[PDB]
Amino acid sequence: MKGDQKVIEYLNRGLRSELTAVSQYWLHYRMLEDWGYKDLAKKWRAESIEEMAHADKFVERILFLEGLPNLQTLDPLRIGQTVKEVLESDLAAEREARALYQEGAAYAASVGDFPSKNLFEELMGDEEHHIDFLETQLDLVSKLGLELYAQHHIGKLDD
Amino acid sequence: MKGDQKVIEYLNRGLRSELTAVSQYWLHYRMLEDWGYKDLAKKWRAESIEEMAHADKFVERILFLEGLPNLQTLDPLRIGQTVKEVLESDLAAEREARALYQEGAAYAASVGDFPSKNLFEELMGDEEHHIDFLETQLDLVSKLGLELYAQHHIGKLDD
Amino acid sequence: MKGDQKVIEYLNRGLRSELTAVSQYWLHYRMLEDWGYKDLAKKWRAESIEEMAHADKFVERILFLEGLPNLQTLDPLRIGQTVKEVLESDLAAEREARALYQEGAAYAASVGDFPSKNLFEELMGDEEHHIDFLETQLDLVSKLGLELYAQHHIGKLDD
Amino acid sequence: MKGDQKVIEYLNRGLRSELTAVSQYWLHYRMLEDWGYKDLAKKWRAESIEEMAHADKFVERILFLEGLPNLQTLDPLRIGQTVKEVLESDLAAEREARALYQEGAAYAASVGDFPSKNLFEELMGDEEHHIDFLETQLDLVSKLGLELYAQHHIGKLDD
Amino acid sequence: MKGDQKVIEYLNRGLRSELTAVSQYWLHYRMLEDWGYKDLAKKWRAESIEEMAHADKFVERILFLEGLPNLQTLDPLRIGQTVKEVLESDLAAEREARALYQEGAAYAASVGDFPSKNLFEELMGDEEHHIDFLETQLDLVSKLGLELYAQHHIGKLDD
Amino acid sequence: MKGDQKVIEYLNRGLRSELTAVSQYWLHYRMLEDWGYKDLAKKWRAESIEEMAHADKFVERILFLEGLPNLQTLDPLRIGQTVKEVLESDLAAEREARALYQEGAAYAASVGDFPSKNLFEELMGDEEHHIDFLETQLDLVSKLGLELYAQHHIGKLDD
Amino acid sequence: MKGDQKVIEYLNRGLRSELTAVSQYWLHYRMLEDWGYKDLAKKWRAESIEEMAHADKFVERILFLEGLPNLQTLDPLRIGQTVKEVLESDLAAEREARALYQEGAAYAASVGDFPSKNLFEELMGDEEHHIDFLETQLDLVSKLGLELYAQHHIGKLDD
Amino acid sequence: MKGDQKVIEYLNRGLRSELTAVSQYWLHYRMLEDWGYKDLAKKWRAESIEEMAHADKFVERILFLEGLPNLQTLDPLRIGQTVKEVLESDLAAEREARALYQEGAAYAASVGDFPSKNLFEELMGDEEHHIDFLETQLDLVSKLGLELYAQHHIGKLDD
Amino acid sequence: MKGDQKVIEYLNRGLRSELTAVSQYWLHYRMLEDWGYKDLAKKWRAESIEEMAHADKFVERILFLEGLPNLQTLDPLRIGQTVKEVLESDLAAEREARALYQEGAAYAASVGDFPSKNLFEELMGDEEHHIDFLETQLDLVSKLGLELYAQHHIGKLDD
Amino acid sequence: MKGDQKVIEYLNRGLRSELTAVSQYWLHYRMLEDWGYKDLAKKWRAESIEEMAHADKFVERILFLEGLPNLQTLDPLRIGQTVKEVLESDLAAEREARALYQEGAAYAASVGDFPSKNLFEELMGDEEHHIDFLETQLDLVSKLGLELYAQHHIGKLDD
Numbered sequence A, B, C, D, E, F, G, H, I, J: 001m002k003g004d005q006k007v008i009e010y011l012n013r014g015l016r017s018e019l020t021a022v023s024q025y026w027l028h029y030r031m032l033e034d035w036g037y038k039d040l041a042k043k044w045r046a047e048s049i050e051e052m053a054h055a056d057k058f059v060e061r062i063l064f065l066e067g068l069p070n071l072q073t074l075d076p077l078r079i080g081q082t083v084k085e086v087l088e089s090d091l092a093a094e095r096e097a098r099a100l101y102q103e104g105a106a107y108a109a110s111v112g113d114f115p116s117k118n119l120f121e122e123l124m125g126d127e128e129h130h131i132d133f134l135e136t137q138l139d140l141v142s143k144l145g146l147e148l149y150a151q152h153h154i155g156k157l158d159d
C-alpha cells in the first residue's frame, strides 16, 4: 500500500537506529563475557535480541508501505572500555533512539498513519524500559562503586 | 592471549562479510514474504540466523585474540527485484565469503594459528553448503522457468 | 455513559462497513469453495469471522455510549466472477474501511474519546494487515499469472 | 549344500544385475538431490536400498549352494542428464533384470531347485512393481510435460 | 560450483576404493555367517554399512564440484578362504585406502579446497580405526591361534 | 474336496518324514540337555517344534483332500552318540526330506494341484534352511574340532 | 600400524604435559577447597578431569602407532600459595601446552600423519579455551582486586 | 590442623604409591584394549579409577594436616608385554602398597592420629581385595594356561 | 553387659563434651540468625543436630555397659560476640573434644573394649571434619577480612 | 596371599563359633515356632541368618589367606527347654563369641594383619548388639515374669 514518503524516511531512520543497537549490544555482550561478568553478559545478549525484533518490525513496515528498507549503514557505535563506559554508551544511544521514535510517532500522527504512529510509540515505550534499566545500573555504580556493582554480576563458572 | 595482527584483520574482514550476509538474507527473507513466497521466506530467515551465529563466532575469536571487533560497516548489499535476482545476489555474496575464508584459513595455517584456521575452514564448508543450495535453486529456475519454480514455494496461507 | 453523537455516527458507519465485509467475505468464501479452491476458501472463511468480531466490537461500543446500533443495511457488495476479481473486490472494500477508521480515529481523538479512538486505530491496523494480504495475492497473480496462483491453493480432496 | 552349477551362474548373473541397479539408483538419487527434486530423490534412495536387499539375497543363496559370489563387476551403467533420461535409464535396466529373473526361475524349475526358482520369481514380481512405478512416471511426463511433472516433486526446503 | 579437476579425480579414486570396501566387507560378512562365526559376521555387516556412508559422501561431493561420479568399477577384490585370510584381505585394502586419502587430503590442501581436504582427513581417521580393529584381531590370532580366536566369536544360535 | 490319490500318497509320505524329524529332533534335544550342551539343546527343541508345525500342515491338507492321514509309523530314527553324530544324523534325514518334497512339489505341479505344490515348495525351502544350519555346525566342527565347537554352546547353569 | 618415530615422541611429550596438568589442576582444586573457595574448587576439579581425557587420548594414539606411552614423569609442577598464584601457575602451564601442540600439529602435518595432526589441533583449541578462562579470571582480579574476585566464588556451605 | 610430620611423610609416600598405581593400571587398561582383551580392559580401567579415589583421599588428608602434597613423582612403573606380565606387574605393586599402608597405619596409631590410621587401614583392606583379584587371575592362568584364560575375556565387538 | 568403669567414665566425659557442643552450636545458630547471617545460621543448626546424634550414641553406649549416663552438667560455654569470635569459640571446643576422644579411644583399646574404641575413633574423625570446617572459615576471614566473609553468607530474605 | 598361621587359627575358631550360633539360633527359632511364640520365632530366624553372614565372612577371609576353612565341627550346643533357658543359652554363647573376637582382634593387630583385625572388631561389635538384645529380654522376664513376657510375643495366627 503506498505509504507517506516522510513516514518511510522515519521508518528507515528507526531501522538504522535499531541495527546500530543490535550490534552495539551484541559487541558489549561479548565484551562483558570476555571480562568475566557473565550475568551482565546474559542480559546484554537478551537486550540485543530484543533490538533484533525491533529492527525486523521496521523492515516489515517499510515493505508494506512500498518503501526500500536500507540496512546498509549503522549510526556510529560507542564502544566501552569498562563496565561503566559500556552502561554510559548504551544509555546515550537509547536516549537518541527514544527521541527519534517520539519524533516519528508525532509525524506519523500528523499525516494519519496511525499504525506507523503506534509502532513508534510502542518502540518508544520499549526504549524507555531500556533507559530505566541502564539508569538503574548507573545509580548502583554511583552508590556502591563500580567494583562492588560488577562483582555481584560475575555469575557462575561453566561446567 | 595476544593474537597475530594479520589473523585478526582476516577475522574482522570475515565479521564484516557475515554481518553483510545477515542483513542481506534478512532483507531478502522479508522481501520474499512481502511477495508471497512463504516457503522461500522461511528458508531465508533460517539462513540469516545461521549467518548470525557465524558473525558471533568471529566476534568471540577476535576478543580472545585481544583484537577490537569492528561491527561498524557492511560490504555493499545486493538487493534483488525478482526471486531470480535474490538467488543471484546471495550466490555472488557467498562466493566472495567462501574465497575470503579460504584465504584466511591459509594465512592462519601459515602462522600456526590452527584454531583460527579451523574456524575459517569450518565456515568455508558451511558457505559451500549455502552455495550448493543457491546453485540448486538457480538450476531449477533454468530447467523449469522462474514461474514454476517460485509457485511451488508459495507455501500455506496464515490462520 | 452518554457518548459524543458524531463519534456514535462514526461507530455506526464502521459497523456498516464491517457487516458489509462479513457478508462479502463469506460469499467469496463459498464461491471459492464452489470453484474448488479450497485453501483460498479456508482463508476467506477465517477473514469473514475476523470481521464478525470487528462488527461485534462496534455494537458493544455504540451501546455503551447510549447509541442505537444500526445493523439494517450494508454498503454495496462487490461480487467477483473470477479469483482475480474476488481479490480486487475485497481490496477495494478494505481500502474504504481503512480510510473510514482513520477518519473515525482522528475525530474521536479531537473530542477526547480516547477509547473510541483506540478502537478505530486497532481496527485500522487490522485492515492494513488484510490489505497487505490481498495486495500480496495480487502481486502473485501479476508475477505468475492467475492460473498458476489459483492452482497452488486448490487444497486437498475431502474424505 | 552342493547346488546346480548353472543355477549358480544365474544367481551370479542376478547379483551382477542387482549391484548395477544399486549403484545406478544411488547415483540417480544423488543427481536428483543435486538438481533439487527432493521428493524424487527420496524415492530413488528408497529404491536403491530395496535393490541392496535383493543383492544380499543373491549372495546368501550362492553361498548356501557352495558357489563363489562375484561382486567384482557391474553391467554398464546408464546415467541420465535430465529427469526424463533418469526415468528411461532405470526402466531399461529394470526390463533387462525382469527378463533375467524370468529366465533364471524357469531354469531353476527345470532342475528341481524350487527355492532358487522362488527367489527368482519373488524378485521378478518386485522388478515388475519398479517397472510399473517407472512407466507411470513416464506416462505423467507424456501427459503433463516434463516441467510440470518434476515441479510437483521438488519437495520441501531443509531447515 | 566448479571444482579442481584433479581434486575430483582423487574423489573418484576414493569412491572406487569405498565401493570396493563395501562389497569386500559385505561378501566377508556373508562368508563369516556361512561359516558360523555370527559375532564376526555382525561386525563385518556393520563395517560394510559404514563404508556405504563413505561412498555416499564421495558421490555427494563430486556432484557439488560438477564432476561425474564413476560407480562403474571396483578395485580388485581380495576374498579370504579362512577367518585369518579375511582379516588379512581387509587390512591390505584398508592400508591402500588410508594412503589414498592421505594423498587426496594433501593435494586438496595444496589447491585450497579445504572442505575436500577435510573430507579426506576425516575418512583417513576413520580408516585408521578400521586398521586398528583389524590389526587387533590379527594380534589375537597370533597370541591365541586362529581356533581359539574364532571360537570366541561364534555367537548365539538363532531362534 | 476329492484330491489326487498320488498327491495324497506324497502328503502322507511327507507326514511320515515330519513325524520322524519331530521325534529325532526331540530325542536329540534331550540328549544334548543330558550331556550338558544347553544352548544346543535349546535350538534342537526349537527345531523339533518347527517340524511339529510341518507335520500339522500335512495332516490338515490330507484331510481337506479327503484322504486318511497315517501317523502310525516313523521312518527309521538315526540316534547320535556324540554331538558330531547328532549333527550328521539330522543332516542325513533333512537331505532325504528335501528330496521327498522336491518330488512331491513336481508331482503336484504335474496334476495341477498348485496349493499342494506350494506346500511342498514352502517346506522344501524350510528344510534347506535346516540343512544350511546343520552344514554350518559341521563346518565349525571341522575347522575348530568338536571340543571347541561344543564347549561354546554349553550355555548358562540353571538358578 | 607403525607410526612416525618423531610423531610418537611429540605424542609422548604431549602425554607428559597432560599428566602434569592433571596433577597440577587436581592439587589446585583441593587447595582451593581447603581455602574455602568451593566454586573455584568445582571448576578446577572439572578442568583436571578434562585433562585426564586428553592424557587418555594420547595414550591411545601412541599405542595404535606401536609406540610405548611413557607415564613415568611429569614436567615440574607450579604450585600457587594464593588464588592469584594458582591462576598464574595454571596459565603458564597452559601456554607451554598450547605451544607444544602447535608444534606437534605442524610436524604431524609435514609427514602426512593427518589424524595425529587433528588430535594436536583439537587439543590446541581446547587449551586455548583454558587460556581464555584463566586470563578472564586474572582480568577480574586486576579490575576488582583479589579479595572481591575470590569472595564471589566461596560458594554454598555443605549440608 | 597441624599434623604429625612423620604421618604426613607416610601420607605423601601413600600418595606416590597411588599415583603410580593410577598410571600403571591406566596404561595396562589401554594395552589390554589394544591387544583386544576388552573385558580385561574394562576391569583395569575400573581399577585405575578406584586408585584415583585413593590418591584424592591422600591429597585431602595431607592438606587438612597442613602438609604439602607432592604429586611430582611416581615410583618406577612395571609395564607388562603379555597378559601374564601385566597381572604379575600389578600384583608386585599392590603387595608394596599394602606393606606401606600397614606401616603407615601402625605409625599413625603409635602417635594417636586415629583418623589417619583408619585411612591407611581402609586402604590396606582395599589393596588386599586387589591382591585377591590378581592372585585369582594368576591361579586361572596356572590351571588353564594363558591362552584359555585371556580368550575368555576378549569380550564383545563394538557396534 | 558390665563395662570397664574407666571406659564408662570416658564415655560420660564424652557425653558432657557433646552436650556442651549441642548447646554452644545451637546458641550460635540463633545468634547468627539474629545478626542476619542466615546461611551461616543454617550450617550451625545442622552442626548442632549432628552433635545431638553424637550425644545420643554416648547415652546408648553407657547404658549398654550398665553405667549411669550423666546429662546434668555442661563444660563451660564459650559465647561469641562477633562472627569471628563464634568461629574461634567453636574451634577451641572442637579441639578439646578431639583430644578427649583420642584419649578415650586409646584407653578403650588398652582394655580390649574395641566397640567403645571404635565409637571414640569414629567421633574423633567427625570432630576433625568440624575442625577442618572451622579452620577454613577462619582462613577466609584472614585472607578476605571479616566483612567480606560474613557478607557472602547473609543468605536470602524470607517470603 | 599367605596369611599369619595363628591369625588363620583364630579365623577358624571364629568360623566354628559362628557355625555353632547359626545352628543354635535356627534350632531355637524352630522351637519357639513349635511352642507358639511366633514373634520371638521371627527374630531368632533373623538372628540365625545374620550369623550365617558372619560364618561366610570367615570362610572368605581364611581362603584369601591361603588357609583351609574347617566347617566339620561345632562347639557344644546349648538347647533350652523354656523360653527363659533359650534366652540364657544364646546369651552364654554370645558372651564366649565376643571374648573370642576380642582375642582374635588383638592378636591380628599385634602382627599387623589390620583387615583381619577389622573383621574381628566389626563382628565383636555385632555380638555386643546380640548380647544387648538378649540381656534386655532377660531383664523383661525379671521385671514382668516369664509368662507376661512370652505372652506379648505370641504374634498373629496364620491365614
Ligand code: HEM
Residues within 6 Å of the ligand: A019, A022, A023, A026, A049, A052, A053, A055, A056, B019, B022, B023, B026, B049, B052, B053, B055, B056, B071
Ligand atoms: C550483530 C548482528 C547480529 C548478531 C551477532 C545476531 C545474533 C543472533 C543470534 C546468535 C540469534 C539466535 C539467538 C538464539 O538462538 O539464542 C539471533 C536471533 C534473532 N535475530 Fe539476530 N543477530 C544479528 C543481527 C540481526 C539482524 C540485523 C536482525 C533482523 C534485522 C536479526 C533478527 C533476529 C531475530 C528476529 C532472532 C530470533 C529468531 C527467532 O527467535 O526465531 N538479528 N540473533
Ligand code: HEM
Residues within 6 Å of the ligand: C019, C022, C023, C026, C049, C052, C053, C055, C056
Ligand atoms: C453473513 C452473515 C454471517 C454468516 C454467514 C456467519 C457465519 C458464522 C459461522 C458459520 C460461525 C461459526 C464459525 C465456526 O463455529 O466455525 C460464525 C461465528 C461467529 N460469528 Fe457469524 N456469521 C454472519 C454474521 C455475523 C454477524 C452479523 C456477527 C456479529 C455482528 C457475527 C459474529 C460471530 C462471532 C462473534 C462468531 C464466533 C462466535 C464464537 O467464537 O463464540 N457473525 N459466524
Ligand code: HEM
Residues within 6 Å of the ligand: D019, D022, D023, D026, D049, D052, D053, D055, D056, E019, E022, E023, E026, E049, E052, E053, E055, E056, E071
Ligand atoms: C552404491 C553402493 C552403495 C551405497 C552408496 C550404499 C548406501 C547405503 C546407505 C547410505 C545405507 C544405510 C541407509 C540408512 O541407514 O538410511 C545402506 C543400507 C543397506 N545397504 Fe547399502 N549401499 C551400497 C551398496 C550396498 C551393497 C553392495 C549391499 C549388499 C550387497 C548393500 C546392502 C545394504 C543393506 C542390506 C542395508 C540396510 C542395512 C540395515 O537396514 O540393517 N548396500 N546402503
Ligand code: HEM
Residues within 6 Å of the ligand: F019, F022, F023, F026, F049, F052, F053, F055, F056
Ligand atoms: C515326539 C513327540 C512330541 C513331543 C515330545 C512333543 C513336545 C511338545 C512340547 C513339550 C510342546 C509345547 C512346547 C511349549 O509349550 O514350549 C509342543 C508344542 C506343539 N506340538 Fe508337539 N510334540 C510331539 C509331537 C507332536 C506331533 C505329532 C504334532 C502334530 C502332528 C505336534 C504339534 C505341536 C504343535 C502344533 C505345538 C505348538 C502348539 C501351540 O503353539 O499352540 N507335536 N510339542
Ligand code: HEM
Residues within 6 Å of the ligand: G019, G022, G023, G026, G049, G052, G053, G055, G056, G071, H019, H022, H023, H026, H049, H052, H053, H055, H056
Ligand atoms: C593417569 C593419569 C590419569 C588418567 C589417564 C585419568 C583418567 C580419568 C578418566 C578418563 C576419568 C573419567 C572416567 C569416566 O568419566 O568414565 C577419570 C575420573 C576420575 N579421576 Fe582420573 N585420571 C588420571 C589421573 C588422576 C589423578 C592424578 C587423580 C586425583 C589425584 C584422578 C581422580 C579422578 C577422580 C576422583 C575421578 C572421578 C571423578 C568423578 O567421578 O566425579 N585421576 N580419570
Ligand code: HEM
Residues within 6 Å of the ligand: I019, I022, I023, I026, I049, I052, I053, I055, I056
Ligand atoms: C540445646 C538443647 C537442644 C535444642 C535447642 C535441640 C533442638 C532440636 C530441634 C529443634 C530438633 C528437630 C530438628 C528438626 O526437626 O529440624 C532436634 C532434633 C534432634 N535432637 Fe535435639 N536439641 C537439643 C538437645 C538435644 C539433646 C540433649 C539430644 C540427645 C541427647 C538431642 C537429640 C536430637 C536428635 C537425636 C534429633 C533428631 C531426631 C530425629 O531426626 O528423629 N537434642 N533437636
Ligand code: HEM
Residues within 6 Å of the ligand: J019, J022, J023, J026, J049, J052, J053, J055, J056
Ligand atoms: C543350620 C544350618 C542352616 C540352616 C537351617 C540354614 C537356613 C537358611 C534358610 C532357610 C535361608 C534362606 C532364608 C530365606 O530365603 O528367607 C538361608 C539363607 C542364607 N544362609 Fe543358611 N542355613 C544354615 C547354614 C548356613 C551356613 C553354614 C552358611 C554359610 C556358612 C549359610 C549362609 C546363608 C546365607 C549367606 C544366606 C542368605 C543368602 C542370600 O540372602 O542370598 N547358612 N539359610
Ligand SMILES: [Fe+3]
Residues within 6 Å of the ligand: A018, A021, A050, A051, A054, A123, A126, A127
Ligand atoms: Fe529497540
Ligand SMILES: [Fe+3]
Residues within 6 Å of the ligand: A021, A051, A094, A126, A127, A130
Ligand atoms: Fe533499546
Ligand SMILES: [Fe+3]
Residues within 6 Å of the ligand: B018, B021, B050, B051, B054, B123, B126, B127
Ligand atoms: Fe556464514
Ligand SMILES: [Fe+3]
Residues within 6 Å of the ligand: B021, B051, B094, B126, B127, B130
Ligand atoms: Fe552463507
Ligand SMILES: [Fe+3]
Residues within 6 Å of the ligand: C018, C021, C050, C051, C054, C123, C126, C127
Ligand atoms: Fe474489520
Ligand SMILES: [Fe+3]
Residues within 6 Å of the ligand: C021, C051, C094, C126, C127, C130
Ligand atoms: Fe478486513
Ligand SMILES: [Fe+3]
Residues within 6 Å of the ligand: D018, D021, D050, D051, D054, D123, D126, D127
Ligand atoms: Fe532388485
Ligand SMILES: [Fe+3]
Residues within 6 Å of the ligand: D021, D051, D094, D126, D127, D130
Ligand atoms: Fe528394481
Ligand SMILES: [Fe+3]
Residues within 6 Å of the ligand: E018, E021, E050, E051, E054, E123, E126, E127
Ligand atoms: Fe571408508
